[PDB]
Design a protein around this nucleic acid. Structure first.
Lengths: 105, 50, 121, 119, 87, 252
RNA sequence: GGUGAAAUUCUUGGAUUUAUUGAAGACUAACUACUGCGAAAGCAUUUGCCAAGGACGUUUUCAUUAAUCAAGAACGAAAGUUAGGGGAUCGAAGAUGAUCAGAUACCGUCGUAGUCUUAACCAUAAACUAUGCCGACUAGGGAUCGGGUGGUGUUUUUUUAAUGACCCACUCGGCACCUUAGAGAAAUCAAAGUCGGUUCUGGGGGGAGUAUGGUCGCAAGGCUGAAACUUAAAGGAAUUG
């Protein structure tokens, strides 16, 4: 039958990584950080229009690397970041940890 | 209880517990030893009590 | 006695804070860490260790209740027919109040957070 | 050829009994009931008629067409039922098989004895 | 014809595969044994009713057996002709 | 020679081999009996330990052996397997029994019974006989019995655990009581005949083992007399006239 | 067609019964059991999706953290009510028929809201286990379901091997019966036992779960809640007619 079911457990693992993470918050700075080449992972929280979502996909494609399309406007990813973030654009950099990037890869 | 187990493949000795919560990785290699399961964690090692 | 038996079985003080310490910093799970190893070693921890400092734990109880609440809240918004489930929402949210009265009394910031920590986290 | 084809139905209501001597095709060859004759009620409900109505059937069925082998098929219990089989042997028909198979079931339902009408 | 085609599906192997699914879910219930049944679409039909002392295997031979001749031929007609089938 | 396997000698405490054979083991059980068990087996058993029975046997025996100074004992077995060996054991001691189907009200309407009340009463199966122990208990008479697993010990004071049915068990256990009574009298004679139940001049069924005078006693009882009877079917005939001829004569 | 018997009804313009096919169409026979689960009310097609909850086993955490609670708050059958969709048999009221002294009755045919669905109200039932809920002890006996400790081998699979059921114990939680004796009027119960924590609440019956006022409800009514007065009883259980 199954693996083990599970995928939502990425939020819980995301939430520890955020505790003392190096990450970048918001589209303008995630884009500065992405222009830097620095980021390993970006998590895109909302149903961004194609034009906005595909630019990110194009950048991902240039890179190696992952991109998690959460995409739900609910923004439970916002629990990690600070609840305020109703829309979430996150890059993840050196957490002081980071098996996470590997795990979702 | 106390249980001495020996890795069949690795041939190394380790001390694992009977009927554990979690997966048992061998420190001898990161291969499995006793498994978690559907309740009653069991084994795939042999030896006796420590 | 109970603590002494496990003292002969394990290996020794100082080493045991370090083995446990890693798993906790990774992400919570006091019960999990504790089922790893080398159990005979882990067995001693309540018996000798005070209990470590940790994020979460008192918060975990509330956190999970809210986690569960949101999922059920969609099922209460959709179709009204839900007569059994609704009480459950009423049981869980409330199990958090029930814990929240004693858990507030030793520390500060549990009082502010705990009230707030229904329907937020 | 080893003669036989005529399907026989025994149609059950507690109140009365009727046969339709149908085919594979589903066409009805002939029909028979009480009230072709003089008596009405329980004079209906009687087993004694159930015997007669079958003979009133059979006799036409045989002599003119002359089909002989016939599968006896019955539907649930009325009083008439036992008598409804028994004459068929002495019908000069050779009953191929006897199947009780009553009619349907199975959930459906409501209070109105919907269920009862069927066995 | 074409209406029968889709409905009696795809080979012998998908009648068998589906029989396998049912037993495992069917343990919902009590543990104890009883009813296992396969139905189907445009005819049709119940191909077979079965008995168990379950698990995984027993039903695959038991499928193989209840799929014997009368049901086999029908499955054969499916794989072959009765009128039109599957591809 | 005995059959397997299962296992303590010692010596001798006379009796062992016979009791060991068939005699022990019975059906359904009670907790009040359960400490006094050996174990459970498959096979429609539940085994009571001989060792545990041994301790009991002496104590019950002690009670009987100690009283020989005028005492009456009452034996009872209304049950079919039990019945005739209880007549046989009862005639030998001279104690009053009820072999047949239990007359009632024995113990507190003492008039039907023997002249003086029984000091003690011995019973095969207390549960079947339970009414009889119940009357005795109100009278405040000690109830002693060969009770198996099947019955709660609560109603009976000195219990000898052992199988209620399959008479080989009743036969030795009762025998061993009698032998012990006989011991504290004179020296021991060789064992009294296997006994036993079943009348002959007939097809028989019940048991006894190691063999002798089963035939002797049975013929002797049958031999004894023309009685007020209930019977069988040859002298009954001869009687129905004897009464019909009398019925006519008028005679008072 | 229908019943005690009949009639209403249906009926030659071709029924009904009968065969097959479709749409609609409510419910889940057989299964379903002294049976399982939800806090309760309740819940039963198989099957998928999200997510809860009690079990055990762990000895991980608070290490006794706990336990009940008027007020407060939540859910709460059915039937009523209301908007809107669907509306098959059914089916109050109501229509004819028989009964019969009378039937608006049982009985039979016909028939609408209703039954049902999504939206929103009602706050009640013989909501029952007539046993509020939390904890301690105090008798056993047959096996039922879940898991866990298994012993053992067999079916059963495959042959290192492990199980779904099972031979055969034990533990833990519920179940219920069978069944204790100190209690129980009793009948009974194993607690309704031995004397607990805690709350609500009782009042001789009829007047009365009513009056009047308040709160709530669209309304139905529900909650809350008696007096003048009247009566020498109401009542329970067990017996003997």
């Amino acid at each position: 039958m199954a693996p083990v079911k599970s995928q939502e457990s990425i939020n819980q693992k995301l939430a520890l990584v955020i505790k003392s993470g190096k990450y970048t918050l918001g589209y303008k700075s995630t884009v500065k950080s992405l222009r830097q080449g620095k980021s390993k992972l970006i998590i895109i929280a909302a149903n961004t229009p194609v034009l906005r979502k595909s630019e990110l996909e194009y950048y991902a494609m240039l890179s190696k690397t992952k991109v998690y399309y959460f995409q739900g406007g609910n923004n439970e990813l916002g629990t990690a970041v600070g609840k305020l973030f109703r829309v979430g654009v996150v890059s993840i950099l050196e957490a002081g940890d980071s098996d996470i990037l590997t795990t979702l890869a | 209880y106390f249980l001495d187990v020996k890795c069949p493949g690795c041939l190394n000795i380790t001390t694992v517990f009977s009927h554990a919560q979690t997966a048992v990785t061998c420190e001898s290699c990161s291969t499995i030893l006793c498994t978690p399961t559907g309740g009653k964690a069991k084994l795939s090692e042999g030896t006796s009590f420590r | 006695e109970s603590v002494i038996e496990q003292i002969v079985k394990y290996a020794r003080k100082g080493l045991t804070p370090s083995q446990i310490g890693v798993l906790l910093r990774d992400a919570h799970g006091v019960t999990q860490a504790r089922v790893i190893t080398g159990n005979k070693i882990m067995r001693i921890l309540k018996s000798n260790g005070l209990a470590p400092e940790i994020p979460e734990d008192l918060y975990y109880l509330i956190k999970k209740a809210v986690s569960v609440r949101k999922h059920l809240e969609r099922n209460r918004k959709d179709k009204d027919a839900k007569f059994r489930l609704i009480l459950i929402e009423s049981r869980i949210h409330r199990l958090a109040r029930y814990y929240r009265t004693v858990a507030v009394l030793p520390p500060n910031w549990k009082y502010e957070s705990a009230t707030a920590s229904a329907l937020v986290n | 050829i080893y003669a036989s084809f005529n399907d026989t139905f025994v149609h059950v209501t507690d109140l009365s009994g009727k046969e339709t001597i149908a085919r594979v095709t589903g066409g009805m060859k002939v029909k028979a009931d009480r009230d072709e004759s003089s008596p009405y009620a329980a004079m209906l409900a009687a087993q004694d008629v159930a015997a007669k109505c079958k003979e009133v059937g059979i006799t036409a069925v045989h002599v003119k067409i002359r089909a002989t082998g016939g599968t006896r098929t019955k539907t649930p219990g009325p009083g008439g039922q036992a008598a409804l089989r028994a004459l068929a042997r002495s019908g000069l028909r050779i009953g191929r098989i006897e199947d009780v198979t009553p009619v349907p079931s199975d959930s459906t339902r409501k209070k109105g004895g919907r269920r009862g009408r069927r066995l | 014809m074409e209406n029968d085609k889709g409905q009696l599906v795809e080979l012998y192997v998908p009648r068998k595969c589906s029989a396998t699914n049912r037993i495992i879910k069917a343990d919902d219930h009590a543990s104890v044994q009883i009813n296992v049944a396969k139905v189907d679409e445009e005819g049709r039909a119940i191909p077979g009713e079965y008995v168990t002392y379950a698990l995984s295997g027993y039903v695959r031979s038991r499928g193989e057996s209840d799929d014997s001749l009368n049901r086999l031929a029908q499955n054969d007609g499916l794989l072959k002709n009765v009128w039109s089938y599957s591809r | 020679m005995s059959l397997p396997a299962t296992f303590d000698l010692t010596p001798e405490d006379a009796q062992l081999l016979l009791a060991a054979n068939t005699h022990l083991g019975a059906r359904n059980v009670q907790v009040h009996q359960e400490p006094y068990v050996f174990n459970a087996r498959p096979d429609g058993v539940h085994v009571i330990n001989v060792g545990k029975t041994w301790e009991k046997l002496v104590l019950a025996a002690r009670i009987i052996a100690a009283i020989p100074n005028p005492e009456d004992v009452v034996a009872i077995s209304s049950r079919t397997f039990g019945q005739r060996a209880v007549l046989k054991f009862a005639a030998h001691t001279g104690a009053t029994p009820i072999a047949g189907r239990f007359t009632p009200g024995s113990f507190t309407n003492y008039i039907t019974r023997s002249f003086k009340e029984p000091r003690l009463v011995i019973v095969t199966d207390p549960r079947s006989d339970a009414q009889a122990i119940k009357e005795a208990s109100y009278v405040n008479i000690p109830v002693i019995a060969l009770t198996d697993l099947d019955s709660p010990s609560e109603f009976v004071d000195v219990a000898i655990p052992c199988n209620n049915r399959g008479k080989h068990s009743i036969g030795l256990i009762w025998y061993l009581l009698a032998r012990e009574v006989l011991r504290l009298r004179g020296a021991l004679v060789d064992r009294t005949q296997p006994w036993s139940i079943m009348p002959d001049l007939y097809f028989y069924r019940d048991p006894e083992e190691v063999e002798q005078q089963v035939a002797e006693e049975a013929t002797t009882e049958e031999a004894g007399e023309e009685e007020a009877k209930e019977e069988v079917t040859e002298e009954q005939a001869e009687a129905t006239e004897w009464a019909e001829e009398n019925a006519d004569n008028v005679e008072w």
